[PDB]
């Protein structure tokens with residue numbers, strides 16, 4: 001460990017006590033931007049590698065979407081010891097999002113509620129940011145093999161979703177290792193942009209198509225077209241809300257198999273939790289420990305319904321190595337953390353990786369890839 005991490009966690013716990021949540025987030029994004037945040041320079045355990053198709057993760061931990069919506073702070077967040085980051089959700093046109101304050105924490109239950117409503121600087125500006133990250137990456141030893149995914153969304157104003165995605169893909173696809181389609185947020189009407197199997201099916205196919213076109217259109221060899229990490233075309237993921245009945249779930253599984261989607265992110269925030277007293281007057285989706293059991297259960301179901309064919313990215317409610325293993329044995333290949341960072345601070349990646357490494361050894365597993373879906 002380090003004093004650096006120690007000093008910052010005191011600082012962060014202080015901010016947690018006094019300051020508004022969104023103000024804290026921005027301050028830490030700002031420290032990152034300025035590169036005063038601490039680095040995890042440790043070698044990751046080779047027995048904790050993971051992959052989704054031919055996309056390779058130096059470790060099983062990344063930061064979920066909504067954390068660095070505008071890609072202002074990628075180098076620093078990655079250097080906290082994460083293998084990947086999912087920037088966005090982005091929109092073609094920048095939006096203010098809903099009225100502030102729109103992030104509320106509950107320390108006792110280690111949980112968050114939000115109604116940001118896709119605030120972001122918009123596709124063009126964010127693409128400029130990612131471009132600059134990619135150039136920084138070519139000369140930053142700590143960033144090599146690190147993965148940046150991009151989460152893409154419809155504008156609140158907009159009538160048609162596909163058009164919005166196509167635009168995003170056209171602008172930012174060249175710089176992405178994967179694309180995350182989310183139709184799972186709370187906070188855009190209504191309540192969840194539709195994932196109607198026919199709708200979703202239509203959505204997924206349009207996305208792959210746009211990506212394919214970029215490959216066709218460009219005259220360059222892949223080494224100079226894909227200005228990303230993998231040097232190949234961005235994979236396609238879809239992020240699902242956990243607020244669906246068992247039938248809606250089975251119908252979605254078919255669609256993912258039908259379209260041969262590269263992976264699924266399970267899951268987004270939920271609107272089905274009331275136990276939080278602080279949150280009673282509040283609007284939006286809930287994150288953190290209260291989501292943990294719900295989202296795990298959801299991982300299991302979709303793992304079964306897709307016949308284990310389709311790779312899973314786990315979110316959220318994961319704070320410990322134990323929480324991580326529970327997601328992995330349910331059928332998840334990689335894990336994403338949001339809430340843990342707010343709760344546990346700068347050290348989350350370092351701590352969780354150690355915790356998982358120890359736990360993998362004490363359960364007799366040889367490597368991480370052996371534990372994926374081992375509850376069946």
Ligand SMILES: Cc1cc2nc3c(=O)[nH]c(=O)nc-3n(C[C@H](O)[C@H](O)[C@H](O)COP(=O)(O)O)c2cc1C
Pocket residue numbers: 064065066067069088089103112114116118151182239267268269287288289291315316317318336337338339340
């Ligand atoms: C403040 C806030 C903003 C979020 N913004 C997005 C977003 O822009 N796109 C997205 O797909 N998920 C977003 N999420 C959902 C997270 O990516 C994640 O799936 C969820 O928090 C569950 O993980 P956790 O329990 O570790 O927090 C957001 C969550 C919160 C807390």
Ligand SMILES: Cc1cc(Nc2ccc(C(F)(F)F)cc2)n2ncnc2n1
Pocket residue numbers: 012013015016020021022024025026028029077080103105341342345346
């Ligand atoms: C205290 C706090 C912090 C914060 N986010 C935050 C940002 C960055 C990092 C860093 F990457 F630095 F770890 C850690 C935490 N939020 N977000 C909503 N409420 C928050 N309250």
Ligand SMILES: O=C(O)c1cc(=O)[nH]c(=O)[nH]1
Pocket residue numbers: 066089114115116117118119182184185186187268269285286
């Ligand atoms: O931008 C938001 O408000 C938001 C998006 C999302 O996908 N999930 C979430 O909880 N909030």
